[PDB]
C-alpha cells in the first residue's frame, strides 16, 4: 500500500492521461462526464467515478489509493452524479475503440514458457498480433491515433482514439471486431476450414 501510494504521489503521469483523455488542453465534457472505475486491494469495485481537472484527478486517485483503475466512456451526464439520476439517463456516447490481446490463447503453441510466464521468445506472437492489427486499422479503416499499452504481465491493449473510432456505436465496433477476428474458433483440435 505504501509503494502504491508513493507511486500515485510522485511517478504516475496524471497530466498526460488527463490531456489524452480530454483531447483538448482545456478541460471539457470528455473528462467531467467520463466514467472511471477503481479496483481496491480488498476487492471492492467502485464505478461511475469522474474527475473535473488534473488536480481533482490527483486528489481523488491518491485518496482512494486503488491498485488499478480502468477507463470508461464519455456519458451525457457526470457519472459521479449517478445516484441523483435515473438508470436510463446515463447514456454512453463516445469511447476509444479497444482491442485486448493475451498470451492465454497461444499456450498451445509455445514451449519457451508454461502457464503464466512470458519472455522475448513468446512475445513474438503478441508482436505479430500488433503488426497485423495495426496494418488492418491503418490500411483498411484509415485510423491514425492508436497506441498499444502493455497489459502488465503478458498482454497488450489497443486504444484507437480517432474521432471516428471514439464515436462508433456498438454494432459498428462488433463489425470491426468480427472483421479482424478471423479465428473465431480457438480450439486446436479441429480444422479452421476458413
Amino acid at each position: 500500500s505504501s509503494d502504491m501510494e508513493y507511486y500515485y504521489k510522485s511517478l504516475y503521469p496524471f497530466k498526460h492521461i488527463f490531456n489524452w483523455l480530454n483531447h483538448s488542453p482545456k478541460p471539457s465534457r470528455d473528462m467531467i462526464n467520463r466514467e472511471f472505475a477503481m479496483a481496491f486491494r480488498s476487492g471492492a469495485y467502485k464505478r461511475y467515478n469522474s474527475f473535473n481537472s488534473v488536480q481533482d484527478f490527483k486528489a481523488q486517485i491518491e485518496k482512494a489509493n486503488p491498485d488499478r483503475f480502468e477507463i470508461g466512456a464519455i456519458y451525457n451526464k457526470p457519472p459521479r452524479e449517478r445516484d441523483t439520476l435515473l438508470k436510463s439517463e446515463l447514456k454512453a456516447l463516445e469511447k476509444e475503440l479497444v482491442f485486448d490481446i493475451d498470451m492465454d490463447d497461444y499456450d498451445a503453441f509455445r514451449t519457451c514458457c508454461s502457464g503464466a510466464q512470458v519472455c522475448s521468445k513468446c512475445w513474438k506472437f503478441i508482436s505479430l498480433a500488433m503488426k497485423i492489427t495495426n496494418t488492418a486499422l491503418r490500411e483498411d479503416f484509415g485510423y491514425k491515433d492508436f497506441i498499444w499499452v502493455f497489459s502488465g504481465r503478458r498482454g497488450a491493449h489497443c486504444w484507437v482514439s480517432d474521432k471516428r473510432a471514439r464515436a462508433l456505436t456498438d454494432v459498428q465496433r462488433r463489425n470491426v471486431l468480427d472483421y479482424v477476428n478471423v479465428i473465431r474458433d480457438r480450439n486446436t483440435d479441429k480444422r479452421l476450414a476458413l
Binding site: 490500411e139 483498411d140 479503416f141 484509415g142 454494432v171 459498428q172 463489425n175 468480427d178 472483421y179
Partner: protein
C-alpha cells in the same frame, strides 16, 4: 465463362464499409482504403424487400381507416383471395 461475361457487364458501387457492415462480415464485398465495392443487385433487392415489408406493416396498421369506403373492399377481397354438335 457465363460468370465472366456477367461480370464484364456488371457495374459496382463505391461507398463506405460502415454502410455495408453486414456484407463486410460475410466477405461479400471487396474493400480498399475504407471503401466497399458492392453483387449490387442483391443489396438493392434486399433493401427493397426490407423497406417494402416495413411499408406493408404500416399499411396494415392504417387499413382499418380504409375499410370505410364501399367501392374498394370487394375488389381488395377478390384480388386477395384470388391467390387461392
Amino acid at each position: 465463362h457465363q460468370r465472366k461475361q456477367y461480370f464484364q457487364q456488371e457495374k459496382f458501387i463505391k461507398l463506405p464499409f460502415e454502410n455495408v457492415i453486414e456484407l463486410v462480415g460475410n466477405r461479400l464485398v471487396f474493400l480498399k482504403d475504407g471503401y466497399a465495392y458492392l453483387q449490387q443487385l442483391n443489396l438493392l433487392s434486399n433493401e427493397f424487400a426490407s423497406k417494402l415489408n416495413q411499408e406493408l406493416i404500416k399499411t396494415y396498421q392504417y387499413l382499418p381507416r380504409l375499410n370505410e369506403d364501399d367501392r374498394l373492399l370487394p375488389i381488395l377481397n377478390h384480388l386477395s383471395s384470388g391467390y387461392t354438335d
